[PDB]
Write a protein that binds this ligand. Structure first.
Ligand SMILES: CN1Cc2cc(Cl)ccc2-n2c(nnc2[C@H]2CC[C@@H](Oc3ccccn3)CC2)C1
Length: 374
């Protein structure tokens, strides 16, 4: 009977590998990777404080053979660790959404980790509040908890998590499409790129502006990296009366925007979704139009950065999908036995025993996803 005894080691090993890699290599200390280390330590703590004695309870026939002092402490630890594990993914999703949506100050982590850990602690507080002790957390004494704690641990995070998770993808998709149409060789490119990015409307104004030319020149001077190449391209486009001149002007402007460290993460995220070939062709056309002899080494850097954003999204989606596939049955049945009229208690309690053990296996699979997708 070594089936579950051995599984403990992969969980702890994968969690401690994530603990060490983020704090040692220094090549992977991105903003989200700090949340990954908190999730890793949370899943490492369940390896030594949840799995061993819970599986030892099997030999005791659901009885507590240890000192009775720590039993409420153990239940508190279990609830705290599950809540932290879910809320860390929730925090990752909401952080990604808020960073992509409003990168003005994000571009220019311990506090967020403390916030989520304190929230989980304040979620798990009520648990401390002849015959022998039997820690099974009976539905009678812990009645309101089985509903409220389950709602606050699974349903409350899963609502926002799903939305925030997609909210980020939405922005990428918005750009992807807008950018593909901008590289499709009509003045519909700007009308969509304006909403995709959020100066952009000034380009559609050009396709004209008698007094907005000063503002346009000021905006062009607002990008020092492109310097006066953008201004020269704008003057040429004004002289050449749009046609292909406006096309290479907007291509150069998009390349310069992707060059700015303010919009670079968002634009790389949008590029992550899409054919990734038409976008490269358009960016290369912009680089050629912009002069900029080092342009190729920059557009290739942009495309390399875009792949990174994409890679992350994939590794994240999988983890989330697993979380949803594995934890959901347990929390679904944990509400069924609270509200019933003829449901046999044994028939629902048998499935809860396997379902609670199923949810904890997700601790040892998140590092596996990273290792496989690295
Ligand atoms: C005998 N034991 C089975 C059990 C085994 C293992 Cl290995 C872990 C936990 C339990 N076990 C028991 N009773 N409870 C639990 C926990 C703790 C409460 C949790 O409920 C939650 C969890 C998070 C948020 C809200 N409620 C269900 C899992 C009875």
């Amino acid at each position: 009977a070594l089936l579950i005894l051995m599984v403990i080691i992969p969980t702890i090993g994968g969690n401690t590998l994530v603990i060490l890699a983020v704090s040692l290599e220094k090549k992977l200390q991105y903003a989200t990777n700090y949340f990954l280390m908190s999730l890793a330590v949370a899943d490492l703590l369940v390896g030594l404080f949840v799995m061993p004695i819970a599986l030892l309870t099997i030999m005791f026939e659901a009885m507590w053979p240890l000192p009775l002092v720590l039993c409420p402490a153990w239940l508190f630890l279990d609830v705290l660790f599950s809540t932290a594990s879910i809320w860390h993914l929730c925090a990752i999703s909401v952080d990604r959404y808020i960073a992509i949506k409003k990168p003005i100050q994000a571009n220019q982590a311990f506090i967020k980790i403390t916030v989520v850990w304190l929230i989980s602690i304040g979620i798990a507080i009520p648990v401390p509040i002849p015959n022998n002790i039997t820690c099974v957390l009976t539905k009678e004494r812990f009645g309101d908890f089985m509903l409220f704690g389950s709602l606050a641990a699974f349903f409350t995070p899963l609502a926002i998590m799903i939305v925030t998770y997609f909210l980020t993808i939405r922005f990428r998709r918005r750009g992807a499409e807008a950018l593909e149409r901008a590289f499709s060789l009509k003045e519909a490119l700007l009308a969509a790129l304006d909403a995709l990015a959020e100066l952009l409307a000034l380009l559609r104004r050009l396709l004209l502006p008698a007094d907005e030319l000063a503002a346009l020149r000021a905006a062009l001077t607002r990008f020092p990296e492109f310097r006066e190449a953008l201004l020269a391209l704008l003057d040429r486009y004004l002289a050449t009366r749009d046609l292909a001149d406006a096309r290479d002007l907007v291509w150069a402007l998009v390349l310069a925007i992707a060059s700015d460290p303010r919009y670079r993460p968002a634009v790389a995220a949008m590029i992550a979704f899409g054919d990734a070939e038409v976008l490269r062709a358009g960016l290369l056309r912009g680089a050629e139009a912009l002069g900029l002899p080092g342009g190729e080494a920059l557009v290739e850097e942009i495309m390399a950065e875009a792949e990174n954003e994409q890679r992350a999204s994939k590794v994240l989606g999988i983890v989330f999908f697993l979380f949803l596939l594995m934890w959901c049955p347990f929390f679904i049945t944990n509400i069924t036995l609270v509200l019933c009229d003829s449901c046999n208690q044994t028939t629902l309690q048998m499935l809860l025993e396997i379902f609670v053990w199923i949810g904890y296996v997700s601790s040892g699979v998140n590092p596996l996803v990273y290792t496989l997708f690295n």
